[PDB]
Enzyme design. Structure first.
Site, short mmCIF file in Angstrom:
data_model
loop_
_atom_site.label_atom_id
_atom_site.label_comp_id
_atom_site.label_asym_id
_atom_site.label_seq_id
_atom_site.Cartn_x
_atom_site.Cartn_y
_atom_site.Cartn_z
N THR A 136 2.94 -24.13 -8.40
CA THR A 136 2.63 -25.31 -9.20
C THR A 136 3.86 -26.16 -9.55
OG1 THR A 136 2.60 -24.05 -11.30
CG2 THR A 136 0.51 -24.36 -10.16
N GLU B 168 7.04 -0.61 3.82
CA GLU B 168 8.05 -0.55 2.75
C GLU B 168 7.82 -1.67 1.73
OE1 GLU B 168 11.36 -0.65 5.44
OE2 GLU B 168 11.67 1.51 5.35
N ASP C 287 18.71 -1.28 4.91
CA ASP C 287 19.74 -1.97 5.64
C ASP C 287 19.64 -3.45 5.31
OD1 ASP C 287 17.19 -1.19 6.53
OD2 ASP C 287 17.60 -1.65 8.64
N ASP D 185 -25.58 11.51 8.39
CA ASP D 185 -26.95 12.03 8.57
C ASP D 185 -27.84 11.81 7.34
OD1 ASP D 185 -26.66 12.80 11.24
OD2 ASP D 185 -26.12 14.86 10.75
N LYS E 215 -1.88 -30.82 -5.95
CA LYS E 215 -1.05 -30.01 -5.06
C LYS E 215 -1.80 -29.72 -3.73
CE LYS E 215 -1.98 -25.87 -7.53
NZ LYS E 215 -3.25 -26.22 -8.18
N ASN F 72 -26.60 18.07 -14.11
CA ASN F 72 -26.43 19.37 -13.46
C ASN F 72 -25.02 19.90 -13.62
OD1 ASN F 72 -29.06 19.55 -11.74
ND2 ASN F 72 -28.20 17.57 -11.14
N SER G 7 9.48 -9.91 14.40
CA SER G 7 10.51 -8.90 14.21
C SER G 7 9.96 -7.65 13.51
CB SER G 7 11.64 -9.46 13.35
OG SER G 7 11.18 -9.65 12.02
N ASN H 119 -5.24 -28.11 -3.45
CA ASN H 119 -6.34 -28.96 -3.92
C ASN H 119 -6.79 -30.01 -2.93
OD1 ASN H 119 -6.97 -27.80 -6.38
ND2 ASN H 119 -5.31 -28.88 -7.42
N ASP I 11 -2.76 -31.80 -11.83
CA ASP I 11 -2.35 -30.61 -11.08
C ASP I 11 -2.58 -30.81 -9.58
OD1 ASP I 11 -1.73 -29.17 -13.53
OD2 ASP I 11 -3.88 -28.99 -13.78
N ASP J 172 -24.28 13.12 -14.20
CA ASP J 172 -24.21 14.47 -13.62
C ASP J 172 -24.64 15.53 -14.62
OD1 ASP J 172 -23.82 16.56 -11.88
OD2 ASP J 172 -21.63 16.49 -11.96
N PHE K 228 -8.92 -22.24 -12.92
CA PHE K 228 -9.81 -22.08 -14.08
C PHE K 228 -10.95 -21.09 -13.90
CE2 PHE K 228 -8.07 -26.40 -14.13
CZ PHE K 228 -7.37 -26.38 -15.33
N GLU L 99 16.70 -4.99 4.85
CA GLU L 99 15.42 -5.49 5.38
C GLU L 99 14.32 -4.45 5.22
OE1 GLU L 99 16.36 -6.40 9.47
OE2 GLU L 99 16.34 -4.28 9.99
N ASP M 188 -10.76 -30.42 -8.04
CA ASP M 188 -10.28 -30.23 -9.43
C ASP M 188 -9.91 -31.47 -10.24
OD1 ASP M 188 -10.84 -27.51 -9.70
OD2 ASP M 188 -8.80 -26.87 -9.28
C1 LIG Z 1 -15.35 -29.86 -11.36
O1 LIG Z 1 -16.47 -29.22 -10.69
C2 LIG Z 1 -16.18 -28.48 -9.58
C3 LIG Z 1 -17.23 -27.94 -8.83
C4 LIG Z 1 -16.93 -27.19 -7.70
C5 LIG Z 1 -15.63 -26.97 -7.29
C6 LIG Z 1 -15.37 -26.22 -6.13
C7 LIG Z 1 -14.05 -26.01 -5.69
C8 LIG Z 1 -13.80 -25.23 -4.56
N1 LIG Z 1 -12.98 -24.17 -4.53
N2 LIG Z 1 -12.97 -23.68 -3.38
C9 LIG Z 1 -12.17 -22.50 -3.00
C10 LIG Z 1 -10.92 -22.84 -2.11
C11 LIG Z 1 -10.15 -21.54 -1.83
C12 LIG Z 1 -8.83 -21.85 -1.10
N3 LIG Z 1 -7.98 -22.63 -2.01
C13 LIG Z 1 -8.58 -23.96 -2.23
C14 LIG Z 1 -10.00 -23.84 -2.84
C15 LIG Z 1 -13.78 -24.32 -2.55
N4 LIG Z 1 -14.11 -24.11 -1.26
C16 LIG Z 1 -14.97 -24.93 -0.66
N5 LIG Z 1 -15.54 -25.95 -1.31
C17 LIG Z 1 -15.27 -26.19 -2.61
N6 LIG Z 1 -15.88 -27.23 -3.20
C18 LIG Z 1 -14.36 -25.36 -3.28
C19 LIG Z 1 -13.00 -26.51 -6.46
C20 LIG Z 1 -13.27 -27.26 -7.61
C21 LIG Z 1 -14.59 -27.50 -8.03
C22 LIG Z 1 -14.86 -28.25 -9.18
#
Ligand SMILES: COc1ccc2cc(-c3nn(CC4CCNCC4)c4ncnc(N)c34)ccc2c1
Length: 452
Positions: A170, A441, A434, A362, A132, A326, A400, A135, A130, A324, A18, A436, A151
């Site tokens: 997701t 690349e 080939d 400089d 996962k 000049n 590799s 989170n 959501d 710019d 978000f 890979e 979240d």
């Molecule tokens: C509903 O009110 C709130 C307020 C603050 C919030 C902060 C975070 C938060 N995000 N990230 C960045 C990370 C980057 C790697 N991937 C995983 C997350 C964070 N990194 C560290 N601490 C955090 N608290 C976050 C997520 C949701 C929040 C919701």
């Protein structure tokens, strides 16, 4: 209440869900916090403001050691500012992949934390939807650290970004009933069950070549314990997974009752009484999974940052041009900063100074603003290019130096890059490939996949 009156931005924490998360500092007390900034314009709102305000106020009063702590809330014409506690231990899975051994006891401790946080939130009628691995944050980068769920409650009031960079990964975790539109708190038990399955096996229960493929499996709801590494797992764990992945939500086990399950009770004992064979295949699989997910995400971010830098290269040159008067194409330090700020509006003093270091060490006179534009943009795009390389290196576990065509099909499928499209781009990059690619690349391919 003005956000900027109280807090100063220190450094970016990432783009999460978000909106971007910025590490901020209280101007008075020095207290650090993570602020989620949600743009009302770039993100639609599901509910009326009253409903949002009430839910926010509730969240501030709630406290649980496995839920991210919300401190404050601000709004202006453009944005919502959600002020939360910062956690520094990174994502749970990025920790897990560094481990040398992983057992059912380890998996159990992890899940009990998640189930505990979820149960508390459901008591208060807040649903995640959501859930996962992204989170699941750690308070410190250690297998002993506490898990904090981030979240909770956002999905109820805000619409998810349909951009694939945001969408990656997701599909594996989403409950079938969410797809069809009628859902409740049970959807979070499903997601947790998917996470548990992955911890014990290293493989998503519902898998596929691309988003639609995965969603098709989730919707059908069929999964198995056929993989060899499920032989190493207790019947008790399998039984809980079945209850969590029950199709019809009313028949699906609750978060509260899942905490009571024999597996959770038995395996989260402080004193390890039971056999703890290292789930070695699961670790190898989990590392492969994480690496793939991280490389696909880095690939999309890299392509995104390339386009962004193209826009900003044009804008910055235009701005300097106007300045710019000049027409000699040479500007001073003051003018360069002002223009940079102009573009930003469209800390500052220091970033220009880094650029001038390389350009005119400089600092004897004036600067070819053209030369400045180039260097300036390269420093902006560094994070993404180095992150891309890092993810490539990490994915390439055998050192590799190459990624196979099969691996590319996985990486691009996950990224929603059409199979025929990427293969055609490969052919343009290397006629005599080939089956890979090396890093350069791969990067050439990505450039071609974003109009370059
Ligand atoms: C509903 O009110 C709130 C307020 C603050 C919030 C902060 C975070 C938060 N995000 N990230 C960045 C990370 C980057 C790697 N991937 C995983 C997350 C964070 N990194 C560290 N601490 C955090 N608290 C976050 C997520 C949701 C929040 C919701």
């Amino acid at each position: 209440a003005i956000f900027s009156d109280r807090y100063k931005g220190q450094r970016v924490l990432g783009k999460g869900s978000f909106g971007e998360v910025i590490l901020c500092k209280d101007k008075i007390t020095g207290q650090e916090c993570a602020v989620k900034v949600i743009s009302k314009r770039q993100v639609k709102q599901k509910t009326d403001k009253e409903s949002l305000l009430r839910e926010v106020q509730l969240l501030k009063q709630l406290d649980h050691p496995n839920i991210m702590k919300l401190y404050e809330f601000f709004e202006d014409k453009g944005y919502f500012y959600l002020v939360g506690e910062v956690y520094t231990g990174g994502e749970l899975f990025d920790e897990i992949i560094s481990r040398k051994r992983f057992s059912e006891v380890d998996a159990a401790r992890i899940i009990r934390q998640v189930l505990s946080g979820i149960t508390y939130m459901h008591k208060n009628k807040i649903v995640h939807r959501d859930l996962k691995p992204e989170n699941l944050l750690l308070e410190s980068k250690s297998k002993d650290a506490n898990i904090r769920i981030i979240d909770f409650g956002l999905s109820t009031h805000f619409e998810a970004s349909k951009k694939m960079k945001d969408k990656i990964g997701t599909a594996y975790y989403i409950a079938p009933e969410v797809l069809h539109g009628t859902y409740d708190e049970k959807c979070d038990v499903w997601s947790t069950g998917v996470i548990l399955y992955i911890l014990l096996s290293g493989c998503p229960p519902f898998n596929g070549a691309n988003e639609y493929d995965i969603l098709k499996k989730v919707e059908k709801g069929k999964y198995t314990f056929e993989l060899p590494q499920w032989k190493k797992v207790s019947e008790s764990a399998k039984d809980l997974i079945r209850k969590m992945l029950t199709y019809v939500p009313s028949m699906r086990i609750s978060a509260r009752d899942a905490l009571d399950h024999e597996w959770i009770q038995t395996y989260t004992k402080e004193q390890i009484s039971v056999d703890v064979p290292s789930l070695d295949n699961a670790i190898l699989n989990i590392r492969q999974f994480q690496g793939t997910q991280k490389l696909a995400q880095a690939a999309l971010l890299y392509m995104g940052s390339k386009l962004t830098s193209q826009d900003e290269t044009k804008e910055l040159t235009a701005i300097f041009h106007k300045m710019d008067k000049n027409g000699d194409g040479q500007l001073d330090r003051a003018e360069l900063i002002e223009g940079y700020k102009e573009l930003m509006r469209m800390a500052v003093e220091h970033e220009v100074d880094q650029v001038l270091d390389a350009v005119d060490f400089d600092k004897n006179g004036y600067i070819e603003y053209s030369e400045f534009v180039t260097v300036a943009m390269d420093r902006k795009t560094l994070l993404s290019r180095e992150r891309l390389e890092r993810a490539f290196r990490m994915f390439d576990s055998d050192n590799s130096g190459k990624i196979s065509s099969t691996e590319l099909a996985t990486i691009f499928g996950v990224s929603d890059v059409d199979s025929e499209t990427w293969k055609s781009v490969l052919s343009e990059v290397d006629k005599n490939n080939d089956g890979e690619v090396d890093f350069d690349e791969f990067q050439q391919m990505l450039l071609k996949l974003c109009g370059n």
